[PDB]
Structure 1
Amino acid sequence: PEMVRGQVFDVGPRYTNLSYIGEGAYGMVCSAYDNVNKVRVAIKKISPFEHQTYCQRTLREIKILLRFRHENIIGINDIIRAPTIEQMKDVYIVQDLMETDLYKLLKTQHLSNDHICYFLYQILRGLKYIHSANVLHRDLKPSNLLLNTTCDLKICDFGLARVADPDHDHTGFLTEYVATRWYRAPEIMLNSKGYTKSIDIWSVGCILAEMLSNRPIFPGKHYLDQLNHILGILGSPSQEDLNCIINLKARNYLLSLPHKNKVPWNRLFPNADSKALDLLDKMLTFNPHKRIEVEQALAHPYLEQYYDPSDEPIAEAPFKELDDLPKEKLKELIFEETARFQPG
């Protein structure tokens, strides 16, 4: 059994010559040489079986990634685990090795307008497919956008993904939220559980703004600072936009704030393409009902060089009840879901 840093990384014999990357939520990550396809790959060790919440996340992401097949979404190439439920303590997920991610790129590299445009197109092309399967990503951010050396972009980390549920999207003011703060839509802090597609378009808008400047646009330092950051740029919500916020704690909080005027996008981003700013404005709309949809974004003049609906596939099999399953049942479903990778 191959070791790495005194931890078992039992992946062989297909996957040889390992190297440590880092930690992920339920275990460690390494690269390795695939000896069938003759290219190096990434492998995540996952060990979720003691905790039902970890089982649900693992099973949900396996189910989603195996259902999906899209150029701009990370695939599962292989899954390694024991032949029996009783011997299965760990699962190893094998994926394409991607040289970098958009977070690392933004820390280190100036992006040309052509790079921005092409990355944005690929994000939206992948998202169109996700949304067409009735799935929400809910944690889109630069570190979840992987890139290889030819600038192919793949969306990853479906650990917070959910089937869309706009009918049950309402909640009270300051409801706790799982996804990364700086890319959360304003409504998360006000009255939304993040069960509609508009949550993802906001996060894309944040990523576009970050690409234009190499810096996060709304780097909130806590839950309500994330909103005071949003309103210092967008300006105070209009009365019309406030008519949507029926919850009094959320309404009255917004009403208590000093009036702020909109900061023009062209002043924040003086070297940006004017069509990029128009599209940015439409993604970063305070009111989620007025926020642009993925297909409208793809069809925006900024992306005209790329837009091709016949080459922007939709899911064949959209997701049309894991919360209250015990961890023992979830282990069984993870076993069943991973059965297709077993030698046979």
Structure 2
Amino acid sequence: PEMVRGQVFDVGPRYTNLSYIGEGAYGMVCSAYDNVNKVRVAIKKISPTYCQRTLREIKILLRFRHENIIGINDIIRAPTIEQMKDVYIVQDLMETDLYKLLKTQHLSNDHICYFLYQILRGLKYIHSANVLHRDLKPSNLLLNTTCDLKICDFGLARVADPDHDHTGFLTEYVATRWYRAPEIMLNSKGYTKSIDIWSVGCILAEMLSNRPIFPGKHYLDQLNHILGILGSPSQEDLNCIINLKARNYLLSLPHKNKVPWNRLFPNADSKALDLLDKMLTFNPHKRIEVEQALAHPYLEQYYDPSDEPIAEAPFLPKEKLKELIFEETARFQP
């Protein structure tokens, strides 16, 4: 079995000529030559007690089939549960991600427009399956050499459950802080589609300036960053927050005026800013939906609902989780 950087990376004979890429949220990732398809591919090593997030991501990615969502090409593991330790996930090799790209590259308006279109196209499919991604951010958006975009990391995804979204003030949240909608800090468990639209809005703003729009240092600092740009919520939007502790927190804050988008983003396309304003709406009920965003004038060059597919239908102890991973990966065995 082959070795990479003082670590076992055992991908059968099918995958050779391993080259270390880096470390992802799961473990070691390499490129390798697929001797069947005659192309370089990416392979992620998953090592265990396994994570719930691994099972969730495998189930989702195997069910989904969309141009703007990363697929699983192959899964490598031992033939029995007793022998199953590591699991290797094989996927298309991508050139980069939008986190790395924004660290070093200015995007043209054309690239911003095209990336936003593809994010929203993928997200339409995800939401059409009644799934929420819940951790959209630049590092979860992959690009190939021709700027085709694919969404990854479904580890925090959940089935949408708007009837059970309400929670108390300051409820702990798992997803990446800078991309969290304001309602997460106030009264929301992140079980509605509007949670993802907020993240997309944050990503758009970050594409416009190469800097995160709301870089909060801690949980409640994230809300002051948001309010520092959007300004204080209106009486009507505050009245929508029925929880008293959340309401009264907002009432306790000094009045903050709105920072106009054209002042934050003086070189931005005006239609991009109109769409940004609609995605970064404080009140999640007033926030634009994925299909509306696709139909916005900014994306007129790309919008084509007949070419924006939707999903065919809507979507434990450690021993049971290991067993379900084994069962879920069975289709890749000969």
Unaligned runs of 5+ in 2: none
Q: Give the aligned length.
A: 334
Query: What is the CA distance between 1:318 and its match in structure 2?
Result: 1.6
Tell me, in whole angstroms, the C-alpha distance in 2 between the residues paired with 1:264 and 1:275. Answer: 14
State the alpha-carbon separation in 1 of the partners of residues 127 and 223 from structure 2.
26
Task: Report the CA distance between 1:317 and its aligned residue.
Answer: 2.6
Deviations 1:286-308 (A, max 9, x none): 00000000000000000000000
Cα shift at 1:22: 2.1
Tell me the SS of whatever aligns to 1:201. Answer: helix
Counterpart-to-counterpart distance in 2, 1:265 and 1:107:
22
Are residues 54 and 285 of structure 1, via their aligned partners in 2, closer, same or farther at CA, if it must alter by over 3 Å? farther
Give TM-score scaled by structure 2 length: 0.98
Structure 1: 5+ residue stretches without partners: 320-324
Give the Å deviation of 1:177: 0.8
The alpha carbon displacement at 1:6 in A equals 1.6
1:167-203: CA deviation from partner (whole Å, max 9, x where unpaired): 1111111111111100000001111110000000000
Which SS does the other structure have where 1:257 is aligned?
A: coil
**Deviation of the 1:218 alpha carbon:** 0.3
Structure 1 runs of 4+ with >3 Å offset: none
Contact 1:82 1:88 in 2 (8 A): yes
Q: CA deviation at 1:24?
A: 2.8
SS of equivalent residue, structure 1 residue 332: helix
Between the aligned partners of 1:27 and 1:286, the Cα distance in structure 2 is 36
SS at structure 1 position matched to 2:51: helix
In structure 1, the partner of 2:45 is 45
Q: Aligned partners of 1:217, 1:18: CA distance in 2, in Å? A: 38
Match of 1:155 among 132, 151, 154: 151
Counterparts of 2:175 and 2:126, CA distance in 1: 17
SS of 1:54 mapped into structure 2: coil
Residues 178 and 216 in structure 2, CA contact (< 8 A), matched pair in contact too: yes
Q: CA RMSD in A?
A: 0.9
Q: Could you tell me whether the CA contact under 8 Å between 2:275 and 2:293 is conserved in 1?
A: yes
Distance 2:157 2:279 in 1: 20
SS in 2 for 1:93: strand
**How far apart in 1 are the matches of 2:43 and 2:270?**
41
**Contact 1:99–1:147 (CA<8 Å) still a contact in 2?**
yes
Give the SS at the match of 1:297. Answer: helix
Maintained 8 Å contact 2:197/2:279: yes
Q: Find the partner of 2:177 among 169, 181, 190.
A: 181
Whole-Å separation in 1 of the counterparts to 2:168 and 2:36 = 52
* C-alpha separation in 1, matches of 2:24 and 2:313: 29
Shift of 1:7: 1.3
2:294 match? 298
Superposed displacement of residue 21, structure 1: 2.0
Aligned ranges 1:42-191 → 2 under 5 Å: 42-48=42-48, 54-191=50-187
Distance 1:10 1:337 in 2: 20
* SS across alignment from 1:221: coil
Q: Distance in 2 between matches of 1:272 and 1:329?
A: 51
Q: Distance in 2 between matches of 1:308 and 1:336?
A: 38
In structure 2, what is the Cα distance between the partners aligned to 1:86 and 1:290?
52
Quote the offset at 1:248 in angstroms: 1.3
Q: 2:50, 2:322 within 8 Å by CA — same for their partners in 1?
A: no
Q: 1:304-343 maps to which residues of 2 (within 5 A)? A: 304-319=300-315, 325-343=316-334
8 A contact 2:167–2:188 mirrored in 1: yes
1:314 deviates by: 0.1
Confirm or deny: 8 A CA contact 1:138 1:160 kept in the other structure: yes
Relative distance call for 1:120 and 1:26 in structure 2 (3 A) is: closer
Q: Is the 8 A contact 1:210 1:216 kept in 2?
A: yes
| Contact 1:26–1:54 (Cα < 8 Å) also in 2 | no
Percent pairwise identity: 100
Distance in 2 (alpha carbons) for counterparts of 1:260 and 1:191? 21
Superposed CA offset, 1:39-89 (max 9, x none) = 1111111113xxxx8431111100000000000000000000000000001
Q: What do residues 137-174 of structure 1 show as CA deviations (whole Å, max 9, x unaligned)? A: 00000010000110000000111111111111111111
Secondary structure in 1 aligned to 2:257? coil
Cα 1:29–1:281 shift into 2, 3 Å: same
Quote the offset at 1:231 in angstroms: 0.4
- Alpha-carbon separation, structure 1, partners of 2:288 and 2:133: 17
Q: Distance in 2 between matches of 1:300 and 1:25?
A: 34
Q: 2:50–2:321: 8 Å Cα contact kept in structure 1?
A: no
1:77-120 per-residue CA deviation (whole Å, 9 max, x = no partner) reads: 00000000000011100011101110111111111100000000
